[PDB]
Scaffold this active site. Structure first.
Site, mmCIF file in Angstrom:
data_model
loop_
_atom_site.group_PDB
_atom_site.id
_atom_site.type_symbol
_atom_site.label_atom_id
_atom_site.label_comp_id
_atom_site.label_asym_id
_atom_site.label_seq_id
_atom_site.Cartn_x
_atom_site.Cartn_y
_atom_site.Cartn_z
ATOM 1 N N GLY A 1 -15.192 23.035 62.241
ATOM 2 C CA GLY A 1 -16.582 22.904 62.659
ATOM 3 C C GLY A 1 -17.561 23.669 61.767
ATOM 4 N N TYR B 1 -23.888 -0.124 8.267
ATOM 5 C CA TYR B 1 -23.307 1.053 8.867
ATOM 6 C C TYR B 1 -23.579 2.273 7.959
ATOM 7 N N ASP C 1 -23.828 17.338 51.033
ATOM 8 C CA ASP C 1 -23.945 15.889 50.887
ATOM 9 C C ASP C 1 -25.344 15.335 51.344
ATOM 10 N N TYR D 1 -26.495 21.365 53.562
ATOM 11 C CA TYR D 1 -25.297 20.530 53.439
ATOM 12 C C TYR D 1 -25.134 20.074 51.960
ATOM 13 N N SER E 1 -27.613 -5.906 -1.291
ATOM 14 C CA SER E 1 -26.849 -6.336 -0.136
ATOM 15 C C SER E 1 -25.354 -6.224 -0.299
ATOM 16 N N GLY F 1 -16.266 19.414 54.408
ATOM 17 C CA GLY F 1 -15.891 18.242 55.187
ATOM 18 C C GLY F 1 -15.178 17.217 54.309
ATOM 19 N N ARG G 1 -14.525 7.884 53.814
ATOM 20 C CA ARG G 1 -15.079 6.555 53.506
ATOM 21 C C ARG G 1 -15.602 6.353 52.071
HETATM 22 C C1 LIG Z 1 -28.176 -7.049 -10.631
HETATM 23 C C2 LIG Z 1 -29.471 -7.815 -10.361
HETATM 24 C C3 LIG Z 1 -30.548 -6.757 -10.011
HETATM 25 C C4 LIG Z 1 -29.873 -8.583 -11.626
HETATM 26 O O1 LIG Z 1 -30.984 -9.502 -11.328
HETATM 27 P P1 LIG Z 1 -31.736 -10.039 -12.646
HETATM 28 O O2 LIG Z 1 -32.170 -9.020 -13.622
HETATM 29 O O3 LIG Z 1 -32.899 -10.857 -12.321
HETATM 30 O O4 LIG Z 1 -30.548 -10.939 -13.318
HETATM 31 P P2 LIG Z 1 -30.171 -11.218 -14.848
HETATM 32 O O5 LIG Z 1 -29.605 -12.611 -15.031
HETATM 33 O O6 LIG Z 1 -31.332 -11.004 -15.818
HETATM 34 O O7 LIG Z 1 -29.051 -10.068 -15.221
HETATM 35 C C5 LIG Z 1 -29.509 -8.724 -15.593
HETATM 36 C C6 LIG Z 1 -28.502 -7.928 -16.423
HETATM 37 O O8 LIG Z 1 -27.207 -7.859 -15.735
HETATM 38 C C7 LIG Z 1 -26.214 -8.129 -16.667
HETATM 39 N N1 LIG Z 1 -25.033 -8.656 -16.015
HETATM 40 C C8 LIG Z 1 -24.753 -9.870 -15.433
HETATM 41 N N2 LIG Z 1 -23.479 -9.880 -14.952
HETATM 42 C C9 LIG Z 1 -22.939 -8.585 -15.282
HETATM 43 C C10 LIG Z 1 -21.656 -7.904 -15.071
HETATM 44 N N3 LIG Z 1 -20.618 -8.474 -14.485
HETATM 45 N N4 LIG Z 1 -21.514 -6.607 -15.555
HETATM 46 C C11 LIG Z 1 -22.582 -5.976 -16.178
HETATM 47 N N5 LIG Z 1 -23.793 -6.488 -16.414
HETATM 48 C C12 LIG Z 1 -23.910 -7.797 -15.923
HETATM 49 C C13 LIG Z 1 -26.810 -9.038 -17.759
HETATM 50 O O9 LIG Z 1 -26.068 -8.973 -19.048
HETATM 51 C C14 LIG Z 1 -28.226 -8.479 -17.865
HETATM 52 O O10 LIG Z 1 -28.394 -7.451 -18.852
HETATM 53 P P3 LIG Z 1 -29.760 -7.393 -19.758
HETATM 54 O O11 LIG Z 1 -30.970 -7.360 -18.863
HETATM 55 O O12 LIG Z 1 -29.721 -6.127 -20.615
HETATM 56 O O13 LIG Z 1 -29.823 -8.604 -20.638
HETATM 57 C C15 LIG Z 1 -29.316 -8.875 -9.206
HETATM 58 O O14 LIG Z 1 -28.331 -9.865 -9.558
HETATM 59 C C16 LIG Z 1 -28.992 -8.200 -7.838
HETATM 60 O O15 LIG Z 1 -27.842 -7.852 -7.540
HETATM 61 N N6 LIG Z 1 -30.067 -8.033 -7.048
HETATM 62 C C17 LIG Z 1 -30.066 -7.402 -5.732
HETATM 63 C C18 LIG Z 1 -30.594 -8.350 -4.663
HETATM 64 C C19 LIG Z 1 -30.413 -7.739 -3.187
HETATM 65 O O16 LIG Z 1 -29.300 -7.626 -2.690
HETATM 66 N N7 LIG Z 1 -31.623 -7.404 -2.598
HETATM 67 C C20 LIG Z 1 -31.925 -6.829 -1.195
HETATM 68 C C21 LIG Z 1 -32.850 -7.814 -0.400
HETATM 69 S S1 LIG Z 1 -32.148 -9.061 0.843
HETATM 70 C C1 LIG Z 2 -8.720 2.414 -3.307
HETATM 71 C C2 LIG Z 2 -9.090 3.805 -2.793
HETATM 72 C C3 LIG Z 2 -8.165 4.092 -1.583
HETATM 73 C C4 LIG Z 2 -8.844 4.833 -3.903
HETATM 74 O O1 LIG Z 2 -9.401 6.140 -3.516
HETATM 75 P P1 LIG Z 2 -8.846 7.358 -4.410
HETATM 76 O O2 LIG Z 2 -7.381 7.456 -4.558
HETATM 77 O O3 LIG Z 2 -9.326 8.651 -3.935
HETATM 78 O O4 LIG Z 2 -9.499 6.981 -5.861
HETATM 79 P P2 LIG Z 2 -8.950 7.183 -7.350
HETATM 80 O O5 LIG Z 2 -10.082 7.448 -8.323
HETATM 81 O O6 LIG Z 2 -7.898 8.284 -7.475
HETATM 82 O O7 LIG Z 2 -8.176 5.774 -7.708
HETATM 83 C C5 LIG Z 2 -6.798 5.581 -7.242
HETATM 84 C C6 LIG Z 2 -6.003 4.553 -8.047
HETATM 85 O O8 LIG Z 2 -6.715 3.271 -8.092
HETATM 86 C C7 LIG Z 2 -6.679 2.808 -9.400
HETATM 87 N N1 LIG Z 2 -7.796 1.925 -9.660
HETATM 88 C C8 LIG Z 2 -9.143 2.149 -9.825
HETATM 89 N N2 LIG Z 2 -9.792 0.974 -10.054
HETATM 90 C C9 LIG Z 2 -8.763 -0.036 -10.046
HETATM 91 C C10 LIG Z 2 -8.729 -1.493 -10.213
HETATM 92 N N3 LIG Z 2 -9.801 -2.221 -10.474
HETATM 93 N N4 LIG Z 2 -7.497 -2.134 -10.136
HETATM 94 C C11 LIG Z 2 -6.348 -1.404 -9.865
HETATM 95 N N5 LIG Z 2 -6.258 -0.084 -9.684
HETATM 96 C C12 LIG Z 2 -7.512 0.541 -9.772
HETATM 97 C C13 LIG Z 2 -6.584 4.025 -10.340
HETATM 98 O O9 LIG Z 2 -6.013 3.693 -11.675
HETATM 99 C C14 LIG Z 2 -5.685 4.953 -9.529
HETATM 100 O O10 LIG Z 2 -4.283 4.828 -9.809
HETATM 101 P P3 LIG Z 2 -3.328 6.161 -9.851
HETATM 102 O O11 LIG Z 2 -3.464 6.931 -8.564
HETATM 103 O O12 LIG Z 2 -1.877 5.714 -10.030
HETATM 104 O O13 LIG Z 2 -3.741 7.030 -10.998
HETATM 105 C C15 LIG Z 2 -10.609 3.915 -2.388
HETATM 106 O O14 LIG Z 2 -11.454 3.673 -3.528
HETATM 107 C C16 LIG Z 2 -10.962 2.973 -1.196
HETATM 108 O O15 LIG Z 2 -11.196 1.770 -1.366
HETATM 109 N N6 LIG Z 2 -10.974 3.590 -0.002
HETATM 110 C C17 LIG Z 2 -11.239 2.951 1.283
HETATM 111 C C18 LIG Z 2 -12.425 3.596 1.988
HETATM 112 C C19 LIG Z 2 -12.848 2.778 3.306
HETATM 113 O O16 LIG Z 2 -13.365 1.672 3.215
HETATM 114 N N7 LIG Z 2 -12.577 3.474 4.474
HETATM 115 C C20 LIG Z 2 -12.846 3.093 5.948
HETATM 116 C C21 LIG Z 2 -13.791 4.155 6.611
HETATM 117 S S1 LIG Z 2 -15.660 3.881 6.751
HETATM 118 N N1 LIG Z 3 -15.536 4.644 9.828
HETATM 119 C C1 LIG Z 3 -14.443 5.385 10.530
HETATM 120 C C2 LIG Z 3 -15.011 6.596 11.407
HETATM 121 O O1 LIG Z 3 -15.981 6.159 12.432
HETATM 122 P P1 LIG Z 3 -17.189 7.036 12.598
HETATM 123 O O2 LIG Z 3 -17.354 7.960 11.443
HETATM 124 O O3 LIG Z 3 -18.330 6.091 12.757
HETATM 125 O O4 LIG Z 3 -17.045 7.833 13.806
HETATM 126 O O5 LIG Z 3 -13.884 7.300 12.112
HETATM 127 C C3 LIG Z 3 -13.085 6.426 13.016
HETATM 128 C C4 LIG Z 3 -11.980 7.296 13.706
HETATM 129 O O6 LIG Z 3 -12.443 8.673 13.963
HETATM 130 C C5 LIG Z 3 -12.508 5.202 12.159
HETATM 131 O O7 LIG Z 3 -11.771 4.300 13.022
HETATM 132 C C6 LIG Z 3 -13.660 4.390 11.454
HETATM 133 O O8 LIG Z 3 -13.141 3.299 10.624
#
Ligand SMILES: CC(C)(COP(=O)(O)OP(=O)(O)OC[C@H]1O[C@@H](n2cnc3c(N)ncnc32)[C@H](O)[C@@H]1OP(=O)(O)O)[C@@H](O)C(=O)NCCC(=O)NCCS
Ligand SMILES: CC(C)(COP(=O)(O)OP(=O)(O)OC[C@H]1O[C@@H](n2cnc3c(N)ncnc32)[C@H](O)[C@@H]1OP(=O)(O)O)[C@@H](O)C(=O)NCCC(=O)NCCS
Ligand SMILES: N[C@H]1[C@@H](OP(=O)(O)O)O[C@H](CO)[C@@H](O)[C@@H]1O
Ligand SMILES: CC(C)(COP(=O)(O)OP(=O)(O)OC[C@H]1O[C@@H](n2cnc3c(N)ncnc32)[C@H](O)[C@@H]1OP(=O)(O)O)[C@@H](O)C(=O)NCCC(=O)NCCS
Ligand SMILES: CC(=O)N[C@H]1[C@@H](OP(=O)(O)OP(=O)(O)OC[C@H]2O[C@@H](n3ccc(=O)[nH]c3=O)[C@H](O)[C@@H]2O)O[C@H](CO)[C@@H](O)[C@@H]1O
Ligand SMILES: CC(=O)N[C@H]1[C@@H](OP(=O)(O)OP(=O)(O)OC[C@H]2O[C@@H](n3ccc(=O)[nH]c3=O)[C@H](O)[C@@H]2O)O[C@H](CO)[C@@H](O)[C@@H]1O
Ligand SMILES: CC(=O)N[C@H]1[C@@H](OP(=O)(O)OP(=O)(O)OC[C@H]2O[C@@H](n3ccc(=O)[nH]c3=O)[C@H](O)[C@@H]2O)O[C@H](CO)[C@@H](O)[C@@H]1O
Ligand SMILES: N[C@H]1[C@@H](OP(=O)(O)O)O[C@H](CO)[C@@H](O)[C@@H]1O
Ligand SMILES: N[C@H]1[C@@H](OP(=O)(O)O)O[C@H](CO)[C@@H](O)[C@@H]1O
Ligand SMILES: [Co+2]
Ligand SMILES: [Mg+2]
Lengths: 450, 450, 450
Positions: A78, A363, A102, A100, A402, A11, A15
C-alpha cells in the site's frame, strides 16, 4: 521553507506488457519518472526519495539525478507502507511532498500553489472534481473542512456519490508525517496500508487539511497502459506546440509537430508538417524547415532552409545554408556559410566550406572541404580501408568532376580540377587537373543480347 | 442453428463520382463489401448471397470467397425486391441475416447479439436511437413490442418524432422470410418494395419482433460518398490503433498510424509517427520503426531498427538488422542477422549476409552476398543486359571498394578485395585483389572554362 | 449596384513577434490580406482600398492587384479614423463594404447575403451571437431594430450581457458613409474614433440598419497571433479537403492533406496521407499519389502513379508514368508516356521519352532522352563545367550501362549501347558500343590493412 519530495514508483505495471519497468517508458523522449523528478527539482526539492520494488538495475541505469535517494519497498503493501519505507529519511524540519512516478504531467505551478496552501502543522491536499469518481478516494468534509479520505472499496454507496476525489498528491511536515505513519493499520477493504488515512489522523489531532485543485485534469492523470501514455504524449505535444506558436514560432500544423527535448529559436522560424525535434536544437532567425524533417542535437544558423525529408543529427549549419530534400547529416557534419547539400547526399565528420556545394548522390565522410568548392554528383570519399578511417582534404576553389572517388588519405590543392570519373589515390597539386581516364572508343554495329 | 447471410449491394453509388462500383472502394486496404463478407463468414455464415445490379465483372474480379452466391437484381425496385431475388436460395430450416454492402464496420459481436435475441418463429431487428432520425425507417411499438417500421417518406409528422430507427439489419427464418416476401406490394410513397414491411407482416401473424442496438453508431453507418468513407476509415484506424496500444504496441501518435492488413507482433515494439503497415506483417520483439516508414508483406526479426522514411515490401529481416534512413527494400530482399543497409540503398531479390553492410548509394539486385562483407558506397550490381537478368555472387569476408560495378553473372571469392572504382566482369579469386584502374596523372596550371 | 471595398489593415500585430507585417503572414500559402482582397474582387469590387500604417514597402512587394488603392493611416486613431482616410475616395453612388485585413476566412456567399440585406439609404451589418461576448461591440436594438453598437469598454455591466456582437463588417452607400464619418468624435472610453458610431448616426437620421449572420464563426475570426493563425489554417484545410472528397477525390486521411494553391483533377484520383499540393497542379484521371508526396506547379497525366516521398516541382508527366519512391523532379523535368523514374533519381530540365527508364541513383540535368531508353543505375549527366551548362542528347533505343558519366555536350545515337562504367566525352554512333574500360586484373593473396 525547506522541502523534500518522495516519489512512489513501486507499483507493478502489468497492463503495459513490457520487459521495461513502467515508469521508464518515455513521454516526449523522456522517462515518465524523469518528468516527475524534473518537476520535483524544479519546485526546489532538497532531496528526491524514489521508492521502487523491482527493475532497480534498469532504473539506476536510466536515472542519474545527484539528489536521488533510492528507497526499496520489496512488498507492495500500500501507498502508506511505501511512505513508511522512506519516512526515516525525512527531516523533522522540512516539508515532504508526495508524488507518483506514473503521473508525468504534474506542473510545478500547481505544486507551488499546493505548497502555499499548506497550513502550519497541517496538510496540503490536491483534489479534483470528476463526473465519474468511480475508483478513487473520496474527500470527506465537515462544515466545509476536509476531514478525511475514504477509498472507493471502503466507501458506502452514499459516500461514492462524493465527486471530489484524491489525486494522491499531498504535502506535510516531515515530523508530523512520521508521527501519523507509525499509526497506520491495514484493517480495511484491501488489507493494505493507506497513506490516505493520515488525513483523518491529522484532523483528529486538530491539524488543518486544505485542499487545492489542479489547473488541468491531464496534470494528475496516471498511466497504467500504453493507450493512456499515448494520450498524455498528445496533451504534452499540443501544449508545447501552442507555447511555441505563442512565442512566435510558426508551426504549419501544431497537431503534426513533435518536440522531444529542448528547442531554442530566433524570430520568424517556420516549421512545416510532421517535423520532429530531438535532444537540444538551436534555430537562428528565419530558419525554414520543410515537411517531415527530423532534427536532433544540432545547431542551425540564421536563414537556413532545410528542405523536405532531411534527417540531421549532431550537425552544425552556419547562416544561409540550404540542405535537402533527402539529405542525411550525421554526427560531425559541418556546413559553413552559404554551403549547399542537395538530394541523396550524406555527410559524416565532414566540413563543407563557404558557398561550397555537394548537390547530389554523394557521400562525404572524414573530410575537410574548403570554400567555393563544387562537389560533382556521385563523388565519394573512401575513408575506410577495412580497419582504419582516413581523412580527405580539399582546398578552396576546387572543382570535383562527377563520380570521382577520393581514396583517403589524400589532399587536393587549392584551385585544382578533378576530371569526371577519376579515382584519386595521390595528392593533387594546386591549380592542376587530376585525371585517370581511358579514352572513349567504339565498336560498330553492336547487337545487345536476345 | 444454421444461418446464411444476404448482402444487398445493388443500389447505385451516384455521389461517388467513380468508374469503380461503390462497394469496391476500399477502407483500410480492403473493399467495403469484403469487410461485410468477412463479418458474415466470421459470424458462421454457411452461404453468402450477394445481390448486385451492375459492375458485375469488376465485382467478380475483386471478390473470390468460395461460399459466395451471386444474385442479380437488374432493376432496383427496393430492398424488398432485392431480397425476393435471393429468397429462392434460402433454406427453409436456416436463419437468414440481411446486411448492406456499404456498411463496412458492422461488428460480429453485435450480429451475434442480434442472432441470440431472435425469437423462434420471429425476427431479430437491429435498431438505433438518433437525435435527428430524419430519412430513416421509424420503429413502431405497441405496449413496448415492435409492431412495424414506417419509412420516412410514408411517415406522418408525428411518427417522424420517433427517434428509434431501423439500421436495416435483421434476421429471421428462411421459410418465414419467403412467406412474407411473397406478400410485398409497392403501394407506398416511393412505389418500391419495402423489405421493412415484413415486420408488420410477422407481427400480424402473431410472431415476435425483438430489437437490439449496436455497440457504436459507426457500426451501422452507410457510405454514399467519399467523405463518409474517409470518416469510417478514421474510425477503423483509431479503433485498430487503440487495440494495438492496449496489446502492448507503442504507437507514438495513434492518430498518425495506418494498418491496412494484418500485424503480428512481439513485445515492446515501438512505432513512430506516420508509419503505414500493409498486407501481412510480422514484427519480432523490440522492433523500432522510425517515422514515415511504409512496411508491406514483410517479416522483421527481434531487435531490428528501421530508421526514418524507409520503404519495405516482401522483405525478410533476421534479428538485429538496422536499415535506413531512406533505404528501399523490394521483393526478395533478405538480410541475415546483424546486417546493415544505410541511406539511398536499394535491394531487390538480393540477400545480404550476417553482419554485412551496404551503407550508401547502392543498388543490389539478383545477388547473394556472404557474411562479414562490406559493400562500399556507390557499388552497383549490373544484373540486366537489356533482356535477361543475371546473378551476382559475393563470398564471405569480401571488401568491395566504393563505386564498383559488378557485371553479372560473376562470382567474387571469399576474402577478396575489390579496389574502389573497379568494373568487375570476371570471377575474382579467393583472397585476391581485383582492380581495373588507370594510374592518376596530372596536368599543371589547368584553367577551367570562362 | 456598384460597389467598392475598403480593407482596414493598419493595426499593429504585436503578438506575432515578427519582422513581417501581420497581414502578410500566410494561410494556405497565401497572405492573409490577399485572401481578403480575393474575396473583395470575387464579390464584384470595383476598387479595393487598402488602409495601412507601416510595412508599406513589404506590402507593395507582396500585393499587386491592379484595382488596389493604397491609403495611408500614419496614426492608428481607431477604425473610424482609418475609414476617414479612405472616405474621400468613395464614390457617392456606390456601396462601400468594410472588411478587416486579418479576418481571412470571410466567405463571398456571406458578403453577398450582407449586400442583399442592406436597405436603400441604410446599412447592412454583419453580427454574430457568442456565448462569451467579452471584448466585442454590443449590438443594441429597439423593438427588434438595430439602433447602435456599444464598445465593450464603454458598455455597462448590463449591456455587456448582450450576446449579439459586431463582427466589424458592414456595408453602406458612399455618400452616406462620408456624411456620418465627418461627425465622428473621440469622446469615449478609448479616446479613439469608432467606425461603430455610424450605426447610431444612421438610425437617428431615420435610416434602417439590418443585421445578417455569418454561416460559420470561423468566417469572422480575426488573427492577432500565430496560434490563432494555425487554427484558421486547419479550418481552411479541413473545408478544402471535404470539398475535394465530395467532388470525388479520395483522400486517405483528410486531416493529413494540405492544399496551398489550386488543384484541378479528373476522376478516381487517390491521395494518400501527408501529401502537400502547392501552386497550380493538374491531375488526370486515376492518378495515385503515395504518402508524403509534395507536388508543386506541375501537370500529371492519366494513370500516373507517384510512389511515396517523391518531390515534384514544375514538372510535366504524360499518361501512365510511374515515379518514386524517393524521386526528385525539379523545374523542366518532363516524362513522356509510360516513362519511369525510380528511387534516388533526380531530374532537372530533362526529358525522358516514352517507355524510358531511369530506375536508380541517377542524375539527369539538361538532357533529351529518346524512347525505349534504359538508363542504368548510377548514370550521371555532367552538364556543368564550372561556368556554363551543356546539353546531353540520347537517341531512341539506347542502353546506358550502370555508372556511366556523360560529359556534355554530347550525343548518343539511336540504338547505341554504352558499357557500364563508361566516361562518355564524344558523340557515340548509332548502333555502336561505346566503352572506356580498363581490363580487370588480379593480385593474389592480398591482405587488407590491420
Ligand atoms: C577533363 C575535362 C575537364 C576536359 O574537358 P575539356 O577541356 O573541354 O576536354 P578536351 O577534349 O579539350 O580535353 C582536355 C585535355 O585532356 C586531355 N585528355 C583527354 N583524355 C586524357 C587522358 N586519358 N589522360 C590525360 N589527358 C587526357 C587532352 O589531351 C587535353 O589536353 P590539352 O588541353 O593540353 O590539349 C572534362 O572531360 C571533365 O571531366 N569535366 C568535368 C565535368 C563534371 O563532372 N562536372 C560537374 C557538373 S554535373
Ligand atoms: C587498391 C587499394 C586497396 C590499394 O591501397 P594501398 O595498398 O594502400 O595502395 P598502394 O599505393 O600501396 O597500391 C597497392 C598495390 O596496387 C598496385 N597498383 C596501383 N595502381 C595499379 C593498377 N592500375 N593496376 C594494378 N595494380 C595497381 C601497386 O603496384 C601496389 O602493388 P604492391 O603492393 O605489390 O607493391 C586502394 O587504392 C583502394 O581502392 N581502396 C578501397 C577504398 C574504399 O573504397 N573503401 C570503402 C570505404 S568508404
Ligand atoms: N564507409 C565505411 C564507414 O561508414 P561511415 O564512416 O560512414 O560510418 O564505416 C562502416 C563500418 O564502421 C563501413 O561499413 C562503411 O563502408
Ligand atoms: C560491354 C558489355 C556490354 C559486354 O558484355 P559481353 O558482350 O557479354 O562481354 P564480352 O566478354 O563478350 O566482351 C564483349 C566485347 O568487348 C570487348 N572488350 C572487353 N574489354 C574491352 C576494352 N577495354 N576495350 C574495348 N573492347 C573491350 C571484347 O574484346 C569483346 O569484343 P568482341 O565481341 O568483338 O569479341 C558489358 O560488359 C557491360 O558493360 N554491360 C552493361 C551492364 C549494365 O550496366 N546494365 C544495366 C542493368 S543493372
Ligand atoms: C490508499 C491510496 O493511496 N489511495 C489513493 C491511490 O489509489 P491506489 O492506491 O488505488 O493507486 P495505485 O495502486 O495506482 O498506486 C498509486 C501510486 O502508488 C504507487 N504504489 C502503490 C502501492 C504500493 O504498495 N507501492 C507504490 O509504490 C503506484 O506505483 C502508483 O504510482 O491513488 C488514487 C489516485 O490515483 C487516489 O484517489 C486514492 O485515494
Ligand atoms: C424500405 C427500406 O429498406 N428502408 C430502409 C433503408 O432505407 P433505404 O431503402 O432508403 O436505403 P438505401 O436506398 O440506401 O438502400 C439500402 C441498401 O440496400 C441496397 N439496395 C436498395 C434498393 C434496391 O433496390 N437494391 C439494393 O440492393 C443499397 O445498395 C443499400 O446497400 O435503409 C435505412 C437505413 O440505411 C432504413 O432506416 C430504412 O428503413
Ligand atoms: C470601434 C470598433 O471598430 N470596434 C470593433 C472592432 O474592435 P477593435 O477596434 O477593438 O478591433 P481591432 O483593434 O482589432 O481593429 C479592427 C481592425 O481594424 C484595424 N484598425 C484598427 C484601428 C486603426 O486605427 N486602424 C486599423 O486599421 C485593425 O488592423 C483590424 O484589422 O472590431 C471588433 C471585432 O473584431 C468589433 O466587435 C468592435 O465593435
Ligand atoms: N551539376 C551542377 C549544377 O546543378 P544543377 O544543374 O542540377 O542545377 O549547377 C550547380 C550550381 O549552379 C553545381 O553546383 C552542380 O554541381
Ligand atoms: N537494373 C534494371 C532492372 O531493374 P530491377 O532489376 O531493379 O527490377 O530491370 C529494369 C526493367 O525490368 C531496368 O530498367 C533496370 O535498368
Ligand atoms: Co564510377
Ligand atoms: Mg557512381
Amino acid at each position: 521553507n525547506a522541502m523534500s519530495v518522495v516519489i512512489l514508483a513501486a507499483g507493478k505495471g502489468t497492463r503495459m506488457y513490457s520487459d521495461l519497468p513502467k515508469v521508464l517508458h518515455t513521454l516526449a523522449g523522456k522517462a515518465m519518472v524523469q518528468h516527475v523528478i524534473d518537476a520535483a527539482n524544479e519546485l526546489g526539492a532538497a532531496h528526491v526519495h524514489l521508492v521502487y520494488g523491482h527493475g532497480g538495475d534498469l532504473l539506476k541505469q536510466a536515472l542519474k539525478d545527484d539528489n536521488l535517494n533510492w528507497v526499496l519497498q520489496a512488498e507492495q503493501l500500500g501507498t502508506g507502507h511505501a511512505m513508511q519505507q522512506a519516512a526515516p529519511f525525512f527531516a523533522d524540519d522540512e516539508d515532504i511532498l508526495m508524488l507518483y512516478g506514473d503521473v508525468p504531467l504534474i506542473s510545478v505551478e500547481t505544486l507551488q500553489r499546493l505548497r502555499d496552501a499548506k497550513p502550519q502543522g497541517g496538510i496540503g491536499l490536491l483534489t479534483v472534481k470528476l463526473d465519474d469518481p468511480t475508483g478513487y478516494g473520496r474527500i470527506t468534509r465537515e462544515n466545509g473542512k476536509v476531514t478525511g479520505i475514504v477509498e472507493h472499496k471502503d466507501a458506502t454507496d452514499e459516500q461514492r456519490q462524493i465527486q471530489e476525489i484524491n489525486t494522491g498528491i499531498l504535502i506535510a511536515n516531515g515530523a508530523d508525517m512520521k508521527r501519523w505513519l507509525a499509526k497506520l493499520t491495514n484493517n480495511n477493504a484491501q488489507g493494505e496500508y493507506y497513506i490516505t488515512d493520515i488525513i483523518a489522523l491529522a484532523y483528529q489531532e486538530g491539524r488543518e487539511i486544505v485542499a487545492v485543485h489542479p489547473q488541468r485534469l491531464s496534470e494528475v492523470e496516471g498511466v497504467n497502459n500504453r493507450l493512456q501514455l499515448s494520450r498524455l504524449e498528445r496533451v504534452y505535444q499540443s501544449e508545447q506546440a501552442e507555447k511555441l506558436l505563442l512565442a512566435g514560432v510558426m508551426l504549419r500544423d501544431p497537431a503534426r509537430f513533435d518536440l522531444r527535448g529542448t528547442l531554442t529559436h530566433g524570430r520568424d522560424v517556420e516549421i512545416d508538417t510532421n517535423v520532429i525535434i530531438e535532444g537540444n536544437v538551436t534555430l537562428g532567425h528565419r530558419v525554414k524547415i520543410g515537411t517531415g524533417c527530423v532534427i536532433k542535437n544540432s545547431v542551425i544558423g540564421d536563414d537556413c532552409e532545410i528542405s523536405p525529408y532531411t534527417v540531421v543529427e549532431d550537425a552544425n549549419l552556419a547562416a544561409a545554408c540550404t540542405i535537402g530534400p533527402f539529405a542525411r547529416l550525421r554526427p560531425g557534419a559541418e556546413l559553413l556559410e552559404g554551403a549547399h547539400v542537395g538530394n541523396f547526399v550524406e555527410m559524416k565528420k565532414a566540413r563543407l566550406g563557404k558557398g561550397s556545394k555537394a548537390g547530389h548522390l554523394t557521400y562525404l565522410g572524414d573530410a575537410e572541404i574548403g570554400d567555393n568548392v563544387n562537389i560533382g554528383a556521385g563523388t565519394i570519399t573512401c575513408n575506410y580501408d577495412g580497419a582504419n578511417k582516413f581523412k580527405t582534404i580539399i582546398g578552396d576553389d576546387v572543382f570535383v568532376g562527377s563520380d570521382t572517388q577520393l581514396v583517403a588519405p589524400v589532399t587536393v590543392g587549392k584551385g585544382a580540377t578533378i576530371a569526371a570519373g577519376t579515382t584519386v589515390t595521390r595528392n593533387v597539386g594546386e591549380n592542376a587537373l587530376a585525371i585517370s581516364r581511358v579514352p572513349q572508343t567504339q565498336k560498330e554495329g553492336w547487337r545487345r543480347p536476345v
